[PDB]
């Protein structure tokens, strides 16, 4: 596999968004992954609607602003036959009436692929060969809230009890040795003001730090 990957440099990733006070990170993770797969399929980068997921995927087991899961979101897009654009179905950070319109759909998926649980090398392969990958992490730490630079490594992080959905857009390393000081490039949904322009480098190949490879998946388009 490549020594480093950054799908942002290839046009697969939209600018950083902000979930604000709504437990909808699972939806931004899911739209980010679908955004990269639709880009690979068609060459057009189109921002997708998180609000469409929040308001309409309760049947699949999501709970809108009270939490959800990316795989359930990809299941909804499949069962539903489509997903509207951010432009047509804007984000308001509160649970609202499902207003899904097929005529505004700009994405579709046939289901999703799961990355073998807990396997960082399997996630590395999915990232290198597919595009941005949705992942769950343990983000419940002041150190993550105030992250700014460097490889994030938090001793209190759990690899099994997770509470936040994010997007792995690549991986890399510091220095000239590609085999050490490795990290996952992660897109967050806390605004570009949080972290490093909305992103964070999470320690990679350090025993599945913060659970990045515990519940990783991507939509099939």
């Amino acid at each position: 596999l490549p020594k480093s990957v950054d799908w942002r440099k290839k046009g697969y990733v939209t600018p950083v968004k902000n979930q604000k006070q709504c437990g909808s990170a699972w939806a931004f993770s899911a739209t980010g992954a679908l955004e990269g797969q639709m880009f690979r399929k068609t060459g057009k980068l189109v921002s997708l609607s998180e609000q469409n997921l929040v308001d309409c995927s309760r049947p699949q087991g999501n709970q809108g602003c009270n939490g959800g899961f990316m795989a359930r979101a990809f299941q909804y897009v499949k069962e539903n036959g489509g997903l509207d654009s951010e432009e047509s179905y804007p984000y308001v950070a509160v649970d609202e009436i499902c207003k899904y319109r097929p005529e505004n759909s700009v994405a579709q998926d046939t289901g999703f692929t799961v990355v073998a649980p807990g396997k960082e090398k399997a996630l590395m392969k999915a990232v290198a060969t597919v595009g941005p990958i949705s992942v769950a992490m343990d983000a419940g730490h002041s150190s993550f809230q105030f992250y700014k630079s460097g490889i994030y490594f938090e001793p209190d992080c759990s690899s099994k009890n997770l509470d936040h959905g994010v997007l792995v857009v690549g991986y890399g390393f510091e220095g000239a040795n590609s085999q050490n000081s490795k990290y996952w490039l992660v897109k967050n949904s806390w605004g570009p003001e949080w972290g490093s322009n909305g992103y964070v480098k999470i320690a990679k190949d350090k025993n599945n730090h913060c659970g990045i490879a515990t519940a990783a998946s991507y939509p099939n388009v």
């Binding site: 979930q19 437990g23 990170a25 983000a139 809230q145 806390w190």
Partner: peptide
């Protein structure tokens, strides 16, 4: 998770 949310920004606190």
């Amino acid at each position: 998770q949310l920004r606190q």
